[PDB]
Design a protein around this ligand. Structure first.
Ligand SMILES: [Mg+2]
Ligand SMILES: [Zn+2]
Ligand SMILES: [Zn+2]
Lengths: 217, 217
């Protein structure tokens, strides 16, 4: 089932990829391609490397220069596409914690990494933020000040789910505190993109907190 | 997370292995071990070679002789262990169809297969039956006369699922007739074991038909 790419705002594109199988259904995962003129920035590589190659095709066929990718944590729906992009000399970005954590697992690692809780890419275009542990110890989010879109990755859950889902890496205890750190940025969010499922509004934050305290208590 | 093996009837054990999905959570997969004095029969291998190692150890730590396995269709949650069992000269069986589908896909093959719609293992202990396509073109079921258990594998869905699961290799329109054919055998079904989810009663068959007619439209 091949990659899908669609525009969700000027210079912002949603890519959805489909990994499946072995007696479970089809799972979808989302990331973005964010444009500043001809220059593209990828947020979370497609699951597989064959779909990541297609995403790179989508970009360059349209004459886009792919400046960098950013992964939102060490798990593979966000990552191991990092290997391919490295092989092409395209800068791959994560948090330091994430880079170290990928190394500990002997998995391929980004060539670039940022050190504190905040970091900006594209000269203003993409603001990254580590709010604390949640779905994973290292999950970050990305804020796009132009389109007023927050990419929540698996730190958040679309309205279509009713369970945080996977928590083996998680800190249900601390999840609620992390989303609140997000709400504290007071981003003027007009849209949230989850790692899985459907794009929605700012209300996805509240719904996520709804499920984090439901599972602590 | 490790295989679980639990007694569900005299001489019948449910083995359940787990795989963990991206932001969705834990998915389980069931098979059975059927004992006959101290001879043991594996109906579906666990979902991975390591969980298959653990099942064989469970058996042999109890003084059981693992006589054979049978796989209910060609997919991984049913056949992952086939390579391992082959390397220990444990006879492995599938239907003729399942075998040729595995060989077509470059996957290791059972060392034995049956040609007809009906077959038996363990000399009547395990009755097999191919009732037509459903979840796959090749799915078979296992009837256990003594315990009165029907192992329906992925041809059936337990009550807690309100979908049909992965349908990219399914025959949605033949699915209902195929369940119908199982009913026609007039097995005094006491428990239905699904490939995923909880063990139930013969209700599971009606539920499954329901879901199947539904998707048909
Ligand atoms: Mg199993
Ligand atoms: Zn299957
Ligand atoms: Zn994750």
């Amino acid at each position: 089932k091949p990659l899908e790419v669609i525009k969700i705002e000027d210079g912002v594109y949603l890519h959805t990829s489909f990994k499946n199988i072995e007696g479970y259904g089809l799972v979808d995962s989302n990331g973005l391609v964010v444009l500043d003129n001809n220059q593209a920035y990828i947020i979370d590589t497609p699951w597989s490397e064959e779909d990541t190659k297609l995403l790179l095709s989508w970009a360059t066929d349209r004459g886009y220069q792919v400046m960098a990718s950013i992964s939102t944590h060490s798990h593979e729906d966000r990552t191991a596409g990092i290997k391919l992009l490295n092989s092409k000399s395209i800068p791959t970005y994560t948090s330091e914690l994430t880079k170290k954590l990928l190394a500990r697992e002997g998995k391929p690692v980004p060539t670039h990494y940022f050190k504190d809780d905040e970091f900006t890419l594209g000269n203003g275009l993409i603001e990254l933020y580590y709010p604390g542990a949640g779905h994973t110890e290292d999950n970050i989010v990305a804020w796009l000040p132009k389109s007023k879109i927050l990419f929540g990755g698996c730190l958040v859950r679309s309205h279509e789910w009713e369970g945080l889902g996977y928590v083996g890496d998680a800190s249900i205890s601390s999840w609620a505190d992390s989303i609140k750190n997000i709400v504290s940025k007071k981003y003027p969010i007009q849209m949230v993109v989850p790692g899985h499922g459907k794009v929605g509004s700012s209300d996805i934050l509240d719904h996520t907190i709804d499920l984090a305290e439901s599972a602590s208590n």
